[PDB]
């Protein structure tokens, strides 16, 4: 018995009459490249992606960010081609490339990358870390306003926050130095939330910082809706995510409902959900910038729990499932003598009635 | 499942096969999988020090 294929079978468009005249791969690299392409296409048979690939929703992710900047491609392309001609004309450039002594200035590359592809690379990286899934329930935005958060450590050093780089709770003891490029007369809202810090509820977050109605980029002059609380990742609980979300306010907003008492040391009050907060203020507020870091427990977190929060420090431990053994049988034929130890609760001698 | 088959470049026999194939032709083979049922573990509250 046979069944006809449900669709076009592989290797079907190949004309087998002119096999000798057909072009061959001849190289492993050319086959692999085509092989990788075929693996990505949708198929009517069972595939690995079906069972292991994450089940993304068919509808596209709603964009809730700022509008893309308008650029003149014609003028931009003209200036770019001219620059390449000037660089290539230099004879010293050709010898350096030919002798493999040339190098690029990383400082300049980052400055240009931050203006051009930075936002999309940050969005791609934010999606990988699960921020859009957790913060906005799948809605994504392009962080078009670069946000530079730095924790002052000592008197001469800074700990920059990028997009997932690790910062310890000790370094984040005090509020960071936040600077972004903003025009005069604009208003912004800056918050800090711990996506994974919440102890009681899995889906909730902790609002570590909230600054509202910030005039321009003068963060110090914003209203302290919620005072700053350093991160307190619990011991043994893993690595947490803390995200700085910059918002661009269309007009002055009132956050009386979101106002937290100063100081706020009640975890019940700190409980916060970004989706609910943004949803109620979505009409007059738009996500603009994004930064986040990864924080694990350190000895300073004990200070936060004992003193600031006036609670006992919760410790967690990674527990693995118990080992599996088949049901014990009265006669374990051909099994080694250690079979019996597998089903033994204690290692100390027992004497029963005696 | 049925997956695209790419051999190891050190595999002399298989590599010779694919280089002689006509362009646009991809080999397929049946693969068997195990979809993990349980997670590696769970974090549990052990103390309140």
């Amino acid at each position: 018995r046979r069944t006809p294929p449900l669709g076009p079978m592989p290797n079907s468009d190949i004309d087998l009459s002119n096999l000798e005249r057909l072009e061959k791969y001849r190289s492993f690299d050319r086959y692999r490249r085509r092989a990788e392409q075929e693996a990505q296409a949708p198929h009517w048979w069972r595939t690995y992606r079906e069972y292991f690939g994450e089940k993304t929703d068919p509808k596209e992710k709603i964009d809730i960010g700022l509008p893309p900047p308008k650029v003149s491609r014609t003028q931009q392309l003209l200036e770019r081609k001219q620059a390449i001609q000037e660089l290539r004309a230099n004879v010293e450039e050709e010898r350096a490339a030919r002798l493999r002594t040339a190098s690029v200035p990383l400082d300049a590359v980052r400055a240009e990358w931050e203006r051009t592809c930075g936002p999309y690379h940050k969005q791609r990286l934010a999606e990988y870390y699960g921020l859009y899934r957790d913060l906005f329930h799948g809605a994504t935005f392009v962080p078009r306003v670069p946000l530079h958060v730095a924790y002052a450590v000592g008197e001469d050093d800074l700990m920059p926050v990028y997009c997932g780089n690790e910062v310890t709770p000790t370094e984040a003891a005090q509020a960071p130095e936040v600077t972004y490029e903003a025009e005069e007369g604009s208003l912004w809202t800056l918050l800090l939330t711990s996506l994974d810090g919440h102890l009681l509820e899995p889906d909730a977050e902790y609002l570590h910082w909230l600054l509202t109605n910030i005039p321009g980029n003068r963060v110090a002059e914003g209203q302290v809706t919620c005072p700053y609380l350093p991160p307190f990742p619990a011991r043994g609980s893993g690595i947490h995510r803390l995200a700085f979300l910059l918002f661009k306010q269309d007009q002055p907003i009132d956050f009386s409902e979101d106002a937290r008492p100063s100081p706020c040391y009640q975890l019940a009050q700190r409980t916060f959900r970004t989706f609910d907060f943004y949803k109620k203020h979505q009409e007059t507020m738009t996500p603009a910038g994004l930064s986040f870091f990864q924080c694990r427990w350190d000895d300073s977190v004990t200070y936060i729990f004992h003193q600031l929060l006036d609670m006992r420090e919760p410790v967690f431990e990674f527990v693995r499932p118990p080992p599996y053994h088949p049901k014990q049988k009265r006669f374990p034929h051909r099994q080694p003598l250690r079979y019996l130890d597998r089903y033994r609760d204690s290692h100390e001698p027992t004497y029963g009635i005696y | 499942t049925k997956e695209v088959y790419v051999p190891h470049p050190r595999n002399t026999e298989a590599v010779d096969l694919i280089t002689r194939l006509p362009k646009g032709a991809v080999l397929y083979k049946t693969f068997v999988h195990v979809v993990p049922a349980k997670p590696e573990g769970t974090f549990k509250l052990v103390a309140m020090l």
């Binding site: 006809p4 087998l16 096999l19 | -």
Partner: peptide, 21 residues
């Protein structure tokens, strides 16, 4: 498998010229 629609998805020797010593 023979009865299934994917029968023969792994065929490859019709795409290669036969080798004769």
């Amino acid at each position: 498998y023979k009865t299934k629609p994917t029968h023969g998805i792994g065929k490859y020797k019709h795409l290669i010229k036969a080798e004769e010593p």
